[PDB]
Ligand binder design. Structure first.
Ligand SMILES: CC(C)CN(C[C@@H](O)[C@H](Cc1ccccc1)NC(=O)O[C@H]1CCOC1)S(=O)(=O)c1ccc(N)cc1
Lengths: 99, 99
């Protein structure tokens, strides 16, 4: 699809067997999802931006379906105020910014 | 242009005759730039990011060029990790997300 930016570019995703809403975010280097259980090992990471940093769990090799497009990569899990699909997975679904 | 997302989508902007670098951020509702002088009056604004909400200065009807496209609109000035062009000005320059 072509998504305009009059409103937040929210899409449905499937992760961990769960349907969620997430923001398509070209300003985010990596994908971050609100607290949930994911399989496998993880390591701690700090991510920050406006208002400072938060501590997250980094899970690798996670499959996520994004508006019907499947893609695999690292997913961070932590107390994000919104679910964010960052560049590490946007590239996999062929997302571009056009103007 | 068509901008892929393998690297951060950084572009040149011009504000007040000065060139700066900024991030095209579909996840940002608002445009926020690092401390600088802008003309006119400002109003208070609370901006929410990954770490919480912070106080910034809101300037309206500011002329800004973004990768050679003209925009005139609201610019926030505050503690940001990088200059961010958000949806308020991305819409003006006709940017869309495509996949
Ligand atoms: C600040 C930019 C450079 C980076 N962030 C992405 C931004 O899109 C971020 C996304 C977001 C939306 C709403 C609430 C919370 C976060 N929007 C943001 O702050 O909007 C502010 C700035 C003006 O408008 C409002 S991040 O969330 O800190 C982050 C960093 C690292 C990764 N791996 C993932 C996310």
């Amino acid at each position: 699809p072509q998504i305009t930016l009059w409103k937040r570019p929210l899409v449905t995703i499937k992760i961990g067997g769960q349907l969620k809403e997430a923001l398509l975010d070209t300003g985010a280097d990596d994908t971050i999802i609100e607290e949930m259980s994911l399989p496998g090992r993880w390591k701690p990471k700090m991510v920050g931006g406006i208002g400072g940093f938060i501590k997250v769990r980094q899970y690798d090799e996670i499959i996520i379906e994004i508006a019907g497009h499947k893609a695999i990569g690292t997913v961070l899990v932590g107390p994000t105020p919104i679910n964010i699909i960052g560049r590490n997975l946007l590239t996999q679904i062929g997302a571009t910014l056009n103007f």
